Amino acid sequence: TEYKLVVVGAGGVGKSALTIQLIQNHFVDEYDPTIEDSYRKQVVIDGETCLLDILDTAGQEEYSAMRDQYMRTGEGFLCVFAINNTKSFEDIHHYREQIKRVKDSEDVPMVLVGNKCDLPSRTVDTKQAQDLARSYGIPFIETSAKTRQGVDDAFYTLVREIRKHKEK
Ligand SMILES: Nc1nc2c(ncn2[C@@H]2O[C@H](COP(=O)(O)OP(=O)(O)O)[C@@H](O)[C@H]2O)c(=O)[nH]1
């Protein structure tokens, strides 16, 4: 019954930084006497227990066998680029197309995230990203793992997108 969230995007856009921040804000210790030591950590976002995974496709993951498995298992996807990395924005479409193909669905919960919005070097405008998100039919939000701007909102929005999808 857990919501399965997957964070995708080019290397270095801040997927780990965003996910670490979310866990730091929202992890709790839950009593469960049916497990070994009786307590397990979990993340609760907007009243939903959430599992979290990060999908990289470059670096060490250039050798991975698991890309499609991440996309099949994930129920909603944070598609992250960095506002100071034009290439990472240009990479977004490929990730979305792969997810849609692997899941064989036109209705996949997603949120477009423009991270590193605290940095003064901007090469991807808000308008560009909002136009892309509108074409996809998904929300767009700008975030900064450094200043914490938008981080919680990005994950909370994705949870609501998954919730609506499961309501259908
Ligand atoms: N200024 C700034 N730097 C960030 C932000 N998020 C991540 N970084 C930095 O970008 C670099 C790569 O981030 P990382 O989380 O490893 O990206 P990943 O490869 O997508 O998981 C690190 O040095 C982070 O400190 C942000 O919002 N603002």
Residue numbers in the entry: 2 to 169
Source paper text:
RAS proteins are binary molecular switches that cycle between active guanosine triphosphate (GTP)-bound and inactive guanosine diphosphate (GDP)-bound states. In the active state, RAS proteins interact with a variety of effector proteins, such as RAF kinase, PI3K, and RalGDS, leading to activation of downstream signaling pathways. The role of magnesium as an essential cofactor for small GTPases is well established as it is required for both high-affinity nucleotide binding and GTP hydrolysis. To examine the effect of N-terminal modification on the tertiary structure of KRAS, we carried out structural studies on KRAS constructs containing iMet (unprocessed N-terminus), lacking the iMet (partially processed N-terminus), and KRAS lacking the iMet and with N-acetylation of the second amino acid (fully processed N-terminus).
Since we obtained higher resolution data (1.5 Å) using KRAS (2–169) and the electron density was observed up to residue 169, we selected this structure for subsequent analysis. Surprisingly, no electron density was observed for the Mg2+, and switch I is in a fully open conformation with residues 26–30 forming an additional β-strand denoted as β’. The β’-strand forms an antiparallel β-sheet with the β2 strand which is no longer a part of the central β-sheet. In the absence of Mg2+, the S17 side chain atom points away from the β-phosphate of GDP. An electrostatic surface representation of Mg2+-free KRAS-GDP reveals a new shallow pocket between the switch I region and the nucleotide binding pocket that may be amenable to structure-based drug discovery approaches. The lack of the iMet in Mg2+-free KRAS (2–169)-GDP structure results in residues T2 and E3 forming a loop structure (instead of being part of the β1 strand) that points away from the central β-sheet. A smaller β1 strand results in smaller β2 and β3 strands within the central β-sheet and as a result, residues within the turn between β2-β3 strands and the β3 strand (interswitch region) undergo a register shift by two amino acids. A register shift of two amino acids in the β3 strand results in replacement of residue A59 with D57. A structural superposition shown in Fig. 3d shows that the side chain atoms of D57 sterically clash with the water molecules coordinated to Mg2+ resulting in displacement of Mg2+ from the nucleotide binding pocket. To our knowledge, the open conformation of switch I observed in the Mg2+-free KRAS-GDP structure is farthest from the nucleotide binding pocket in all the small GTPase structures solved thus far.
